[PDB]
Amino acid sequence: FSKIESEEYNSLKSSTIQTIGTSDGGSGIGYIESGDYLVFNKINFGNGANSFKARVASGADTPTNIQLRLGSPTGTLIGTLTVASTGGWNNYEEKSCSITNTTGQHDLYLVFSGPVNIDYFIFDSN
Numbered sequence: 042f043s044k045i046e047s048e049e050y051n052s053l054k055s056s057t058i059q060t061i062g063t064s065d066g067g068s069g070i071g072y073i074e075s076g077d078y079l080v081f082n083k084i085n086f087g088n089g090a091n092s093f094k095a096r097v098a099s100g101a102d103t104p105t106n107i108q109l110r111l112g113s114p115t116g117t118l119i120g121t122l123t124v125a126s127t128g129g130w131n132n133y134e135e136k137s138c139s140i141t142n143t144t145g146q147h148d149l150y151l152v153f154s155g156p157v158n159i160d161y162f163i164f165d166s167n
């Protein structure tokens with residue numbers, strides 16, 4: 042549940058997504074459109090996690106939400122990270138939001154409401 046690179050998803054649903062280069066020679070996911078989602082099979086939150094942090098970039102004219110659901114694309118919604126513009130598609134920063142205390146192993150789904158670039162995300166226990 043610690044740190045997960047979004048380019049290393051197990052599956053996804055989209056007709057636009059592509060693996061892009063992120064700042065500092067890193068890799069990530071871009072060309073996301075409303076409705077798309079990334080799937081990360083069997084993530085183990087262990088004893089629990091109540092925080093979500095993601096390194097994202099956005100040069101959009103409107104904010105984008107990243108819903109965090111478990112089990113399926115419509116699964117339990119444990120949190121939603123709203124990503125306001127960061128001034129550019131290559132202006133990456135870490136944004137955090139809380140999530141309902143989640144424990145054990147689950148299949149993680151990230152559902153997007155629009156375009157945003159995402160490098161990696163982390164689950165912690167604040």
Ligand SMILES: [Ca+2]
Pocket residue numbers: 046047048063067068069070159160161
């Ligand atoms: Ca990455």
Ligand code: NA
Pocket residue numbers: 071072073074155156157158
């Ligand atoms: Na995008």
